[PDB]
Design a protein around this ligand. Structure first.
Ligand SMILES: CCCCCCCCCCCCCCCCCC(=O)OC[C@H](COP(=O)(O)OCCN)OC(=O)CCCCCCCCCCCCCCCCC
Ligand SMILES: CCCCCCCCCCCCCCCCCC(=O)OC[C@H](COP(=O)(O)OCCN)OC(=O)CCCCCCCCCCCCCCCCC
Ligand SMILES: CCCCCCCCCCCCCCCCCC(=O)OC[C@H](COP(=O)(O)OCCN)OC(=O)CCCCCCCCCCCCCCCCC
Ligand SMILES: CCCCCCCCCCCCCCCCCC(=O)OC[C@H](COP(=O)(O)OCCN)OC(=O)CCCCCCCCCCCCCCCCC
Ligand SMILES: CCCCCCCCCCCCCCCCCC(=O)OC[C@H](COP(=O)(O)OCCN)OC(=O)CCCCCCCCCCCCCCCCC
Ligand SMILES: CCCCCCCCCCCC(=O)OC[C@H](COP(=O)(O)OCC[N+](C)(C)C)OC(=O)CCCCCCCCCCC
Ligand SMILES: CCCCCCCCCCCC(=O)OC[C@H](COP(=O)(O)OCC[N+](C)(C)C)OC(=O)CCCCCCCCCCC
Ligand SMILES: CCCCCCCCCCCC(=O)OC[C@H](COP(=O)(O)OCC[N+](C)(C)C)OC(=O)CCCCCCCCCCC
Ligand SMILES: CCCCCCCCCCCC(=O)OC[C@H](COP(=O)(O)OCC[N+](C)(C)C)OC(=O)CCCCCCCCCCC
Lengths: 49, 132, 69, 90, 61, 491, 105, 158
């Protein structure tokens, strides 16, 4: 959010049917990390609760 | 009151299979004793031909009001909002804009909205700021 | 109280307040596994990840748009 | 090893020679798989630009986006039965 | 027994598969990119397969 | 090598088993050693042959080249030319793998005559395995119809209460229709003077004569992959056949009809396949929607899985008739994924429950997750795979088949997406009922899944999730083979 | 059927109509002070017609009393959590006690 | 180890207690099923069948086969799909697309510089990936011009 950096781990290929190519790729942009704060934070306290 | 769900037949004759009025097993008294307390059924009780639609596994049946009365209340409630939305639209009671819609420089940012040349422009242009 | 029938019903998640006698020993064997894998997952994450905003400089893109033209 | 495609056309051979006809079908299949490979490369160029440009993605990625949407309908596998069994000239 | 007959078996497959994959990745560097199963045989090439096809089509005709 | 080793060894095995069992018949009563432990030695020799059959094909899988277009491993045996291409290789692999599993499923749940059962199972598997590797319509038909003789006897001898009705159904439904496929095969032999695949792929016929041959062949296919309205044989036969007969009749026999499209309709009748594809979609979409709704009102446990088989096969036919690589690859992966999930359910429904309580009525089973937890984990796990959960191999097959359907026909082909919702209706209702509420008051607590029945489940689930996570194993073989099936001229 | 006043079975019917009446009042009225006031009245309405020696006069009230409850029935009655219909009914039922009969599959 | 008298011990131990419905060192060979004569095989039937008579789904005769014969077959199948040198058609088409760049652009020094320094392992991931490799020239060259002869195979037009 503050340092304008992005992360992308691409495990391997999933579908490779001619032009349709899909990877097991995981990225964390501003929006992906804007949603990982509400999700993981609350869920941790829910498990603690 | 106590009405049975839709599509349950009034009559059936499947040869020698016994005839018996349909009973909505979901509405049996939950306190009475049963051989199968979860299904509220006693052993060796006969089943209706469509008993699969009249037991605890079938979709829940709600009999608080008649299925027609529910439509009237349901449609009326959205019907009430329809007139509230219609009158404003018919009357035009919603307020006018207090300022001109936002304009943009550089030919409405035509190039910056995915345009190549000046012939298309209006295809990709935003609100043009003609008043620089 | 009531009977869990624990002689035979042995699901992977125990069942009805199950706790083995040697639970303290096994947890340290498990707490290692969580630690062994979390450390292992950190290595792969650093080695196999990248920043998708710095792989190609804008000087290289500017040639691509013109070449396709 | 890397086998070379047998560059051969349906318009120069006799289908009675089922050995040559096989190459005309195999040559028309291999060229099409190149176009998809060419297409997947072009799409990769589009993805870098959009990620790198951000707001300017509409400008810095203009002709790539134009070209990709042009090659898409025809850069796909179509088989050889269409062209083997039909005569465009007629 | 945490190390009983059932718990261990996935890890035997899990660790073994990782080892052989790393083994095979190495084996390609020292054997010109050819895989760990190169000993079992060789891929059929077009030149060998085309002779069979031509005799098959000739007899058919 | 292949077919020659595949027939000669199996014939030798069949002769060996017959010699051992029938030696003591004679004039005197016999209490020999081979009868001890329920013919256990003779069942073992039958189980080994199933494993060895897999080793024969792998000897030839190594030589397979994924970058060569055309049939490989071509050989002539019994004046018939055989061979393998990309599509045929994988289906052969599925057929032989279900060999050991079909035999293992019936290890100790037949009243007797295990040697006859073991011989028939290995015989049906070989006949179906050989059906993917012939290279003419006549030899395709010979192997396509020879499986009736053991299957009709097997279902009649070893069947359930209605085995006579089931036997009279598979024999007549699959013969009175496949005889219509014989007529179109004969007409190919009259005008062209040959039924070889390659020779007939290069010929174009008049668009009137294309419509006749297509109607004849698709009649024989619409019964094997049961399309409404001629599906009535499959639910009946499944509910009455032996458990091993259900694994083959669902695992393989249905997929012989999708392979029937690949050889007999798309290459040689390409022009008329385009015309019928709108009609094929109408029949298959109505098969998809009606079969899903009919399943919601069924009571027999083993029938309910039978109709779930029909809904998936309708989707497979939808994809294969899509004229793109996405639909064709998706349809074939779904056939492979359905080839493991479908047999697994019959083991859960007609092989684990039915071997303990001997009743297939749904009303007796509920709350099974209390005293049978290991059963309910697999029933839950296989319920999701059967409904295209994204991590399984069925989702890859269904998503691509739906994607290919929309590509071919955006308007009506979009209705294939109803497969995602409807498959979760009849299936999850069945699972939610079985493993919900209190344990049933009509059943009695017994053993959970035995070690053998776990082995069957684990090795039908393991291939399913590999194809789901990494389907490129199947795709790398299919791509060059499936690209020869597409008919389109773009100018 | 017929209604026989002062018979044991007829009294229990009137007892049942009383639990329907007061619980329904309890369902709508959520303050005790307001509830006792209305609950007192219902008993007075129940005890004013205590003395009846006629069959047919009594059956009309039974017809009327059912109608009074049906129209005034709450659309969300209060239920104890562990009683049937409650929030915790059937939760965590202890498993059945029975011997496992092994089968040689 | 048929051990004919070992049956007679089972015979005598049972005979002493004829009452019915009221051990480990027994293990045959392949010889006893076929070579042995009927009379010695005749007694073995009674001992084995009725030993169970005086009675957990283990040792059913299959685990020795499936775990030794079937499971390694799957590993062999799983191995082949993992470490086989089968080149798929599309993976071939990626190498062929680049091999034409070399043949069609031999005058371009910079382009061949990137192809030369490239390793044969990273051919399948051209573009954005974890590998620290430069391919801007490779991607740029393909964008500017086409390198297929699909029209070259079609000598007939409308
Ligand atoms: C479009 C029409 C949908 C096409 C399919 C029609 C539904 C077919 C029946 C599905 C099977 C029903 C079932 O699974 O069993 C009953 C189950 C129980 O639900 P329920 O009774 O409500 O539980 C109450 C508990 N207090 O019932 C269910 O939970 C099913 C839940 C609803 C099923 C989805 C139906 C689509 C709803 C679309 C609504 C928007 C319409 C626009
Ligand atoms: C049940 C067990 C069944 C066992 C069979 C399963 C198959 C085993 C997997 C074979 C893969 C072997 C292997 O590890 O290859 C090494 C691979 C090399 O590729 P590399 O480039 O270095 O990785 C970065 C990716 N760009 O490097 C890598 O693979 C590293 C990439 C790992 C990415 C996956 C991590 C997230 C998914 C797993 C999370 C769960 C981890 C814990 C699971 C239990 C493990 C103890
Ligand atoms: C002992 C020697 C055996 C006989 C050897 C021989 O004479 O060779 C004939 C043939 C060898 O094969 P070959 O001549 O090269 O050409 C294929 C012809 N079958 O080998 C044979 O013809 C033997 C094949 C007979 C056994 C197969 C019987 C088929 C049974 C029906 C299979 C179901 C097919 C559907
Ligand atoms: C639980 C879910 C179950 C499965 C989901 C069910 C929905 C899937 C099927 C619907 C698919 C989406 C709707 C199809 C139309 C959307 C595509 C489209 O935009 O069609 C436009 C196209 C031409 O567009 P246009 O430019 O307007 O025509 C003039 C051409 N010079 O052609 C048209 O004009 C189309 C005209 C409107 C579409 C008519 C058919 C709609 C489908 C009706 C099915 C009824 C059941
Ligand atoms: C009861 C069920 C029991 C069975 C359950 C099975 C679950 C096991 C999960 C794994 C399933 C099998 C997938 C792994 C085997 C296939 C690996 C593979 O194909 O890697 C290919 C990949 C790219 O191929 P290439 O670069 O050309 O070189 C490879 C040469 N073989 O080469 C690579 O570099 C990839 C290296 C490996 C990367 C990590 C693989 C981890 C796989 C698990 C995570 C899958 C992705 C995450 C999914 C979780 C949900 C998001
Ligand atoms: C992304 C993929 C994630 C996969 C990770 C799996 C973790 C969950 C494992 C649960 C095992 C277990 O224990 O389930 C079994 C539990 C155990 O009950 P218990 O609480 O031990 O009590 C034991 C006493 N009972 C059983 C009387 C309560 O009972 C059941 O039969 C519940 C019904 C089946 C549950 C199926 C869940 C499967 C997970 C979903 C697979 C896609
Ligand atoms: C991630 C979490 C996944 C869920 C884990 C829980 C279940 C684990 C399980 O079922 O494991 C067991 C399995 C199989 O072992 P088995 O000997 O047949 O099982 C019997 C267990 N005994 C020995 C204790 C009796 O092992 C595996 O892992 C297998 C990995 C994949 C097999 C590779 C073959 C692929 C061939 C086809 C390729 C196209
Ligand atoms: C440390 C971090 C990683 C931990 C991962 C777990 C490793 C241990 C696994 C072995 C446990 C085991 O096999 O048991 C787990 C269970 C029980 O079966 P069982 O053990 O035979 O039951 C004993 C039976 N008796 C009494 C006869 C001996 O298996 C299963 O039914 C697995 C069902 C599938 C689970 C969900 C798979 C869905 C795939 C989703 C992801 C791809
Ligand atoms: C790959 C193709 C090869 C060709 C095979 C031809 C079959 C002839 C076998 C005769 C052996 C025999 O009569 O033996 C009988 C054997 C085994 O009987 P059992 O249980 O041991 O004895 C039982 C009596 N007891 C236990 C008291 C001793 O059962 C079989 O016949 C099974 C296979 C044939 C069934 C279907 C025949 C259909 C033929 C048409 C197919 C298109």
């Amino acid at each position: 959010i503050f340092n304008e950096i992005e992360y992308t781990y691409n495990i391997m290929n999933w579908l490779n049917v001619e032009y349709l190519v899909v990877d097991w790729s995981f990225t964390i942009d501003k929006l992906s990390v804007s949603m990982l704060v509400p999700v993981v934070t609350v869920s941790f306290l829910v498990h603690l609760y | 009151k106590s009405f049975l769900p839709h599509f349950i037949p009034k009559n059936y004759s499947y040869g020698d299979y016994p005839r018996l009025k349909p009973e909505n097993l979901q509405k049996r008294d939950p306190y009475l004793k049963y051989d199968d307390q979860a299904n509220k059924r006693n052993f060796n009780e006969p089943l209706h031909p469509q008993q699969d639609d009249l037991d605890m596994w079938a979709p829940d049946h709600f009999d608080f009001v008649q299925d027609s009365i529910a439509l009237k209340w349901f449609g009326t409630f959205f019907g009430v909002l329809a007139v509230f939305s219609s009158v404003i639209y018919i009357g035009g009671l919603y307020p006018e804009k207090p300022a001109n819609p936002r304009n943009y420089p550089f030919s409405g940012l035509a190039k910056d909205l995915g345009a190549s040349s000046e012939e298309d422009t209006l295809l990709y242009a935003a609100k043009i700021d003609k008043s620089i | 109280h009531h009977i869990h029938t624990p002689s035979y019903i042995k699901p992977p998640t125990g069942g009805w307040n199950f706790t083995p006698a040697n639970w303290k020993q096994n947890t340290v064997l498990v707490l290692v596994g969580f630690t062994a894998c979390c450390v292992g997952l950190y290595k792969l994450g650093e080695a196999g990840s990248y920043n998708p905003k710095l792989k190609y400089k804008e000087e290289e893109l500017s040639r691509w748009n013109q070449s396709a033209k | 090893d890397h086998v070379r495609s047998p560059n051969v056309s349906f318009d120069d051979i006799d289908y009675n020679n089922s050995q040559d006809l096989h190459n005309a079908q195999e040559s028309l299949l291999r060229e099409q798989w190149i176009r998809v490979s060419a297409l997947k490369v072009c799409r990769k160029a589009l993805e870098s630009c959009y990620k790198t440009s951000g707001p300017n993605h509409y400008e810095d990625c203009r002709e790539i986006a134009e070209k990709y949407l042009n090659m898409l309908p025809d850069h796909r596998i179509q088989g050889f039965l269409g062209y083997q069994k039909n005569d465009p000239s007629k | 027994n945490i190390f009983n007959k059932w718990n261990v078996t996935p890890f035997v497959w899990l660790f073994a598969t990782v080892g052989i994959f790393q083994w095979d990745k190495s084996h390609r560097e020292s054997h010109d990119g050819k895989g760990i199963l190169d000993f079992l045989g060789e891929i059929k090439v077009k030149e060998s397969l085309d002779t069979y096809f031509k005799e098959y089509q000739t007899k058919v005709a | 090598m292949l077919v020659q080793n595949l027939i000669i060894f199996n014939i030798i095995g069949i002769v060996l088993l017959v010699l051992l069992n029938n030696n003591n018949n004679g004039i005197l009563n016999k209490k020999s050693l081979l009868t001890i432990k329920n013919e256990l030695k003779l069942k073992q020799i039958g189980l080994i042959i199933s494993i060895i059959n897999i080793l024969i094909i792998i000897e030839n899988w190594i030589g397979f080249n994924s970058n060569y277009y055309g049939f490989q491993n071509i050989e002539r045996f019994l004046n018939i030319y055989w061979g393998i291409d990309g599509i045929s290789l994988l289906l052969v692999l599925l057929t032989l793998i279900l060999g050991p599993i079909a035999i293992l499923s019936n290890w100790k749940n037949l009243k007797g005559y295990y040697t006859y059962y073991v011989i028939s199972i290995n015989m049906l598997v070989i006949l179906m395995a050989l059906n993917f590797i012939c290279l003419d319509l006549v030899s395709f038909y010979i192997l396509f119809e020879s499986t009736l003789a053991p299957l009709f006897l097997l279902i009649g001898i070893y069947g359930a209460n209605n085995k006579n009705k089931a036997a009279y159904y598979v024999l007549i439904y699959t013969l009175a229709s496949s005889l219509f496929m014989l007529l179109s095969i004969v007409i190919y032999y009259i005008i062209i003077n040959s039924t070889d695949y390659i020779y007939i792929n290069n010929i174009i016929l008049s668009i009137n004569l294309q419509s006749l041959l297509f109607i004849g062949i698709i009649i024989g296919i619409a019964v094997k992959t049961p399309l409404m309205p001629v599906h009535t044989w499959l639910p009946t036969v499944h509910s009455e056949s032996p458990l091993g007969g259900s694994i083959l009749l669902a695992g393989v026999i249905l997929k012989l009809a999708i392979y029937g499209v690949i050889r007999l309709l798309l290459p040689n009748l390409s022009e008329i396949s385009m015309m019928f594809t709108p009609i094929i979609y109408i029949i298959s979409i109505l098969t998809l929607i009606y079969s899903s709704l009919i399943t919601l009102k069924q009571t027999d446990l083993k029938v309910i899985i039978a109709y779930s088989s029909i809904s998936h096969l309708a989707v497979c036919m939808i994809g294969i008739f899509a004229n793109n690589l996405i639909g064709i690859n998706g349809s074939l992966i779904l056939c492979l994924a359905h080839g493991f999930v479908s047999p697994a359910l019959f083991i859960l429904v007609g092989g684990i429950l039915y071997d303990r309580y001997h009743n297939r009525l749904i009303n007796y089973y509920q709350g099974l997750s209390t005293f049978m937890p290991i059963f309910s984990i697999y029933l839950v796990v296989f319920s999701f795979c059967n409904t295209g959960t994204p991590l399984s191999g069925n989702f890859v097959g269904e998503f691509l088949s739906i994607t290919g359907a929309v590509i071919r026909h955006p308007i009506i082909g979009s209705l294939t997406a109803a497969s995602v919702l409807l498959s979760a209706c009849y299936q999850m209702k069945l699972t939610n009922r079985l493993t919900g509420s209190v344990f049933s008051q009509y059943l009695h607590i017994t053993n959970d899944v035995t070690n053998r029945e776990i082995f069957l489940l684990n090795w039908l689930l393991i291939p399913t999730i590999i194809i789901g996570i990494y389907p490129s194993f199947v795709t790398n073989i299919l791509n060059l083979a499936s690209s020869t099936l597409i008919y389109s001229v773009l100018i | 059927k017929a209604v026989v006043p002062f018979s044991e079975a007829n009294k229990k019917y009137v007892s049942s109509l009383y639990r329907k009446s007061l619980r329904t009042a309890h369902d709508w009225i959520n303050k005790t002070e307001f509830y006792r006031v209305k609950a007192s009245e219902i008993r007075s309405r129940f005890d004013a017609n205590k003395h009846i020696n006629d069959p047919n006069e009594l059956k009309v009230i039974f017809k009327e009393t059912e109608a009074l409850l049906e129209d005034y029935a709450h659309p969300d009655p209060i239920i104890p959590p562990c009683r049937p219909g409650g929030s915790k009914f059937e939760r965590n039922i202890p498993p059945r006690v029975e011997a496992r009969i092994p089968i040689d599959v | 180890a048929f051990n004919l008298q070992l049956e007679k011990e089972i015979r005598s131990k049972i005979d002493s207690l004829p009452k019915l419905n009221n051990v480990t060192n027994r293990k045959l060979s392949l010889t006893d099923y076929l070579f042995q004569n009927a009379a010695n095989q005749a007694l073995y039937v009674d001992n084995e069948a009725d030993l169970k008579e005086l009675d957990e789904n283990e040792n059913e005769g299959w685990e020795k086969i499936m775990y030794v014969g079937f499971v390694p077959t799957m590993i062999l199948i799983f191995a082949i799909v993992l470490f086989k040198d089968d080149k798929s058609i599309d993976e071939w088409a990626m190498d062929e697309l680049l091999l034409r760049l070399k043949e069609k652009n031999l005058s371009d020094v910079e382009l061949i510089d990137e192809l030369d320094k490239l390793s044969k392992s990273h051919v399948g991931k051209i573009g954005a990936s974890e590998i620290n490799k430069r391919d801007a020239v490779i991607i740029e060259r393909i964008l500017n011009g086409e390198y297929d002869q699909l029209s070259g195979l079609k000598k007939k037009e409308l």
